[PDB]
Amino acid sequence: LPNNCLNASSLKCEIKGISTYNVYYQVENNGVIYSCVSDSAEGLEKCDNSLNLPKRFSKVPVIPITKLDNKRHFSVGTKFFISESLTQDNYPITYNSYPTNGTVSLQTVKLSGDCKITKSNFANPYTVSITSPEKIMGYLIKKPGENVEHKVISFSGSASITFTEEMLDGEHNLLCGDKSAKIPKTNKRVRDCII
Amino acid sequence: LPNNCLNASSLKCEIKGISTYNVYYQVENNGVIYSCVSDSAEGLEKCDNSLNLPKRFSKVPVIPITKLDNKRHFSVGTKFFISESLTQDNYPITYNSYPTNGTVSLQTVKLSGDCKITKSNFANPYTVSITSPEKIMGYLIKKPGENVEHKVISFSGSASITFTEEMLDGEHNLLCGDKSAKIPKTNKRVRDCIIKYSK
Numbered sequence A: 001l002p003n004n005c006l007n008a009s010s011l012k013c014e015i016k017g018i019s020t021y022n023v024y025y026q027v028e029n030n031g032v033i034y035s036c037v038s039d040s041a042e043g044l045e046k047c048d049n050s051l052n053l054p055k056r057f058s059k060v061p062v063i064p065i066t067k068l069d070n071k072r073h074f075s076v077g078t079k080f081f082i083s084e085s086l087t088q089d090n091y092p093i094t095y096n097s098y099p100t101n102g103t104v105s106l107q108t109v110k111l112s113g114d115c116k117i118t119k120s121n122f123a124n125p126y127t128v129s130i131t132s133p134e135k136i137m138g139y140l141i142k143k144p145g146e147n148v149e150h151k152v153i154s155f156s157g158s159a160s161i162t163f164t165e166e167m168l169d170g171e172h173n174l175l176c177g178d179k180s181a182k183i184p185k186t187n188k189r190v191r192d193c194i195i
Numbered sequence B: 001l002p003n004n005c006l007n008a009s010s011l012k013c014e015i016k017g018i019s020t021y022n023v024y025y026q027v028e029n030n031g032v033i034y035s036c037v038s039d040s041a042e043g044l045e046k047c048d049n050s051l052n053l054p055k056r057f058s059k060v061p062v063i064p065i066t067k068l069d070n071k072r073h074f075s076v077g078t079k080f081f082i083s084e085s086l087t088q089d090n091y092p093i094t095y096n097s098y099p100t101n102g103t104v105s106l107q108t109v110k111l112s113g114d115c116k117i118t119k120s121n122f123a124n125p126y127t128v129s130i131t132s133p134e135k136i137m138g139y140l141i142k143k144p145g146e147n148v149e150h151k152v153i154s155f156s157g158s159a160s161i162t163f164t165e166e167m168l169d170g171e172h173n174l175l176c177g178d179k180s181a182k183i184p185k186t187n188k189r190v191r192d193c194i195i196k197y198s199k
């Protein structure tokens, strides 16, 4: 019964770690430290070392990056996941209110889900549509290397994106989940022209 | 520099852990320990604890399981991956001979890739075919919650999977990459009849 973790305001707790999309905390109760990870940020506002805890965690679908090449081009932050311990000392954790045993590890993250970057946008070639079936789905335009941790945008059923004059250089990328599409370099003149 | 790792044979290498799909080892060149993770066990035969090393670690594409409900249905073994340490102290390891920074983390992994399954021509009614665009691809029929390790079959391009009596119970799932399919209960004797007399 991991109910100790969902009511952390009542008890003593330590924020053991804050990622981009979730938080690692342990609460102390009955003399028994209970370790936990959640997406909420709610009722942990009083915990030790909670100061930087954001108001809200994004809650878009994301998975860990497995190919190290891809970090630069696809990284969209960090998040905690339940791994298993190298020593046989696995201790029980609660992940988003699911009970398990394991060890917590932080891991750099790429966007996941099913999204549709529609390359043909004829009505205005600089207003592009994005459509996904998922309840919630996330996009982000990212030159490879830029720190864009909290710059992700969540769009639910469908969306439409107009590129800023800044982003139009050849090296930016429209990441929307498992999909990824290179943004072409618009000439110095033409860019000023359109606006 | 991975150069020190990839030359396992020479140095005092200590196998520090074996997983279903890769191995964690650290070697020793002139007083500095280099932790490493590798997707094949060439070399390392004399390494300190090579006793349990597969001859081949499978190279089928797998990613880590994030939604922990799936684990029961999708398990397909465990693989080392590289993570960033919770404490600020991340150290240098080489992961499949790429130098980078972090900490070694072990996770339970599901199959990933592209393969599709509905297949063939109303024939070999107990056989279906799996086709995949990628170079290598994995499949595995797993009753949810089975002990499967190095039970995963590497196939390229195409394969045809002829079910058995056991699989045809209403409980086994055909795991192939990103897909799963449920194998339903057949009338065993209808099958039994067919296998018996037909060509």
Ligand SMILES: *[C@@H]1O[C@H](CO)[C@@H](O[C@@H]2O[C@H](CO)[C@@H](O)[C@H](O)[C@H]2NC(C)=O)[C@H](O)[C@H]1NC(C)=O
Pocket: A003, A004, A006, A007
């Ligand atoms: C704070 O802790 C108590 C102690 O567990 C929780 O009481 C549980 O309430 C949940 C309902 O959400 C039930 O599943 C359990 O039957 C209760 N367990 C008990 C009484 O031991 C309480 O609910 C927690 N706070 C919140 C908001 O759920």
Ligand SMILES: *[C@@H]1O[C@H](CO)[C@@H](O[C@@H]2O[C@H](CO)[C@@H](O)[C@H](O)[C@H]2NC(C)=O)[C@H](O)[C@H]1NC(C)=O
Pocket: A090, A091, A092, A100, A101
């Ligand atoms: C981790 O959680 C599991 C889940 O209960 C504990 O594993 C044992 O699981 C069996 C089967 O459900 C039970 O019969 C045992 O009573 C469980 N053991 C205990 C102590 O509850 C496991 O022990 C937990 N803790 C660890 C592994 O340190």
Ligand SMILES: *[C@@H]1O[C@H](CO)[C@@H](O[C@@H]2O[C@H](CO)[C@@H](O)[C@H](O)[C@H]2NC(C)=O)[C@H](O)[C@H]1NC(C)=O
Pocket: B003, B007, B010
């Ligand atoms: C494996 O490690 C050893 C280090 O002890 C390397 O040994 C020497 O490398 C030099 C060139 O760097 C050669 O000229 C020698 O013939 C090697 N042997 C000895 C006994 O000194 C060896 O080259 C390494 N193998 C690699 C890097 O592939």
Ligand SMILES: *[C@@H]1O[C@H](CO)[C@@H](O[C@@H]2O[C@H](CO)[C@@H](O)[C@H](O)[C@H]2NC(C)=O)[C@H](O)[C@H]1NC(C)=O
Pocket: B090, B091, B092, B099, B100, B101
């Ligand atoms: C792994 O991280 C360490 C730091 O934890 C790196 O050491 C840094 O090296 C860069 C460039 O060589 C310097 O700018 C930093 O000042 C160093 N930091 C410290 C704390 O010494 C190390 O280079 C990293 N390893 C790799 C392979 O990138």
